[PDB]
Design a protein around this nucleic acid. Sequence first.
RNA 1: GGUUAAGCGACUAAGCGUACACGGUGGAUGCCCUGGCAGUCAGAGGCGAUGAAGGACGUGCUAAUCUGCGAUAAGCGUCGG
RNA 2: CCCGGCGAGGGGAGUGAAAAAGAACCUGAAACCGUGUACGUACAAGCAGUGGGAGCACGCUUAGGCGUGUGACUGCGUACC
RNA 3: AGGACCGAACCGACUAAUGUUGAAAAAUUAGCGGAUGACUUGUGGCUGGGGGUGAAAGGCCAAUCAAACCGGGAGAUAGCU
RNA 4: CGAAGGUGUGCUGUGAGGCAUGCUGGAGGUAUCAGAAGUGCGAAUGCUGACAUAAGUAACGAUAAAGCGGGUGAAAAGCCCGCUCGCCGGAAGACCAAGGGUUCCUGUCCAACGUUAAUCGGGGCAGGGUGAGUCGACCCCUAAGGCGAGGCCGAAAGGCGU
RNA 5: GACGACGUUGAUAGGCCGGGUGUGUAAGCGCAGCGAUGCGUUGAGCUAACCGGUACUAAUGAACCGUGAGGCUUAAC
Lengths: 33, 109, 46, 120, 55
Amino acid sequence: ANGEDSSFGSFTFTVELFSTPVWIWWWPRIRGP
Amino acid sequence: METIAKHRHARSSAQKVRLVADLIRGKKVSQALDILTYTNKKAAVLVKKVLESAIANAEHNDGADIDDLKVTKIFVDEGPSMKRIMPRAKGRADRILKRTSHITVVVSD
Amino acid sequence: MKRTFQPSVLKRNRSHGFRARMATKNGRQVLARRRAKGRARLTVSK
Amino acid sequence: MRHRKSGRQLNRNSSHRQAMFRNMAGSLVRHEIIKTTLPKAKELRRVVEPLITLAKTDSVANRRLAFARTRDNEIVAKLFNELGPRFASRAGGYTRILKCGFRAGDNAPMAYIELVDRSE
Amino acid sequence: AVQQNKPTRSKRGMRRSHDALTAVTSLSVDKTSGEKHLRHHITADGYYRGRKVIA
RNA sequence: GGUUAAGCGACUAAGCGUACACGGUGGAUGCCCUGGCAGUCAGAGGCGAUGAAGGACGUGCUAAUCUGCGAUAAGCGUCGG
RNA sequence: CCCGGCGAGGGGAGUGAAAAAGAACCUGAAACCGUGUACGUACAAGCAGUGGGAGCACGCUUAGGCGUGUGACUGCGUACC
RNA sequence: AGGACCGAACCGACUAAUGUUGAAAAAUUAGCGGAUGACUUGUGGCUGGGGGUGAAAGGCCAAUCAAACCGGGAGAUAGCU
RNA sequence: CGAAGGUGUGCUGUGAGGCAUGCUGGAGGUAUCAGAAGUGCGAAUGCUGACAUAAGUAACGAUAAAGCGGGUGAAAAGCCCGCUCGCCGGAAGACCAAGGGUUCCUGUCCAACGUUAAUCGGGGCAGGGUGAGUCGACCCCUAAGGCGAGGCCGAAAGGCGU
RNA sequence: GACGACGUUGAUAGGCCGGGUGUGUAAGCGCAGCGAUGCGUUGAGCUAACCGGUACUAAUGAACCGUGAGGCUUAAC
């Protein structure tokens, strides 16, 4: 009656992918010094 | 005479739907409808929609007598996945696959 | 925590705005490179 | 181990269970039929039926106890004025539990609990 | 904490050997309305054991 | 015949492997040009206070957006085709 | 037109030479994942192949053979860079 | 009166557990120190890379500091993998 | 009236390979003999895209706390209304700044999005809404500072400054 | 998951009745005292999971699965 919308403004979701190098501590595991 | 009804791009992973689809393969349509009615799964609703549509297609486009129809074939194929992002800790992002599926029911006698 | 970007329009314009670029010849070359490359937006000015 | 212990804790602490069952008992008394999960019934009985037993005999002290258990004067009034008289000759068992399927939102087992009379 | 070799599709289906669903296969019939329902459950129309209980 | 006793045994498929048929996901390959790439030859080597390059904002019957234009605004005049 | 939520998707109908050319659109490979069918598989240890070798399924042939798939058991055998 | 005292805001940061693909690329919770001062906070400005600025730690200078980032030399060079 | 390419099957050579025709496809491909190569991949913690595995496994974001009865719709634990019950209260209530920028109000819709469903939405899509002599901005004036006619210096470039 | 009892031919759970037990003299009212408070009715009231009962409520007829006489060979009887 009112009209079913199909424009679908947000149907272009696209989406990418990213990451971040994290900080670590290997001092106690060191076999040496 | 075989009659086909499909639900393409159904919003559920194939595995979850196959769990239900295996439950009614080879059954009579009335018994299959009962089994689907009393199964507590989201996929049961989808599969029952498709099976009802297949019965209606048979009765209308083809011959008739719902009484002697059987679920001759049923299978679920993987549909295209939707890529999404779930942000994780420490600035990492993960890929989420929102899996879909194609549901096919073939009724016959 | 407090991150590095603390927005402020006045400081943005005074530091990277168009008239800031035009004031020195190096800034004018920044505009020259950006015009040559074909940027839609030369500066932060808006 | 859980040997001989009684009473579901229903993923809630003590005060919240007490408040929830007080509210639910009030609801059952005013409406005479309500729909909850099957495990919340079978625990409502252990709350609501003792109030009806208390209401079979009418006195100021008993009304004060009922008000302490359900802090609603309308509920106390209906208890002592109708439900006590209605169940005067009934030796316990004032409620029925009827399984009625599963909830759409979370597939929880539902049930109807009602007073056995409901004016039929 | 993590696999050293990729498990095969064989081991996948062998673990899912136990994941199959079970049908109810035991619908009861109300003696008054004739409706099908779960055993010890209200019918869709509100009957139980031949008595109208909800409406 | 039957009955026992001993010896032996097709019959199992929850699932799974292989082959084969047939689908789905996915986008290769072949084919094709909208555009690129390297030259050759003929020009032109500038523009701008009569306001440049580059823009902003408007303008149609419009709603963005692109293109043309500039309040004479998808345009005006004149001479030619 | 039918199912469905006056959904989505599908089944028909017509259009076209073709719709597994239906717009998620030329062809449509591989990885990947289904569904069926044939055979083998729940007392047997390991680079999973190869060499012998029953049986079964089918098609040719029609007793008998042959081909193909699958393969009990056995000899040997610890990937590549 | 006090670079007084206790103690909120506020500004810090001694300890413990937890979290470690975290709610967070250093937090949360429980305590803890100061809290009229060598105090804290707002809004502008100013000092620039062998440079700044530093009650000092090779601290900090846009989650980057025994020498910031961006672009060029530059396809630096590498008897090495 | 069936090109390349695929997908098959047979045949043939020491090999790399070739050849034939079944199917799909729908428009190209090329014996020979010469000539030129962006001429051959399985690995480089190769590169780019697709799809696996773990795996239906972890999680679903402060342990302030909910339960009824309705309404609506195709459907409601989550939407709404009512009734009680918890939580903040120098805050979790307001009012603004900075920054954002239409998120505001209203009607539709449910694909995508919302860590679940969603009938709901700061989602989509449309329409409306911001009304000033006294409030601000602009503007009068100046601080830190910046720029600075001339000027004084500095190969240029520029620096400092009345 | 399994395991055990029970489904009306029934005590399998709740409630209910009676007890037990734990706490310690409920509410209401009276009395005394200026009052706080005491006292009495009153060891009264209440009492999770305990014991002994009791069908008041819930354990529903279906249906489902599983069959129709069990291979062969010798040897005895």
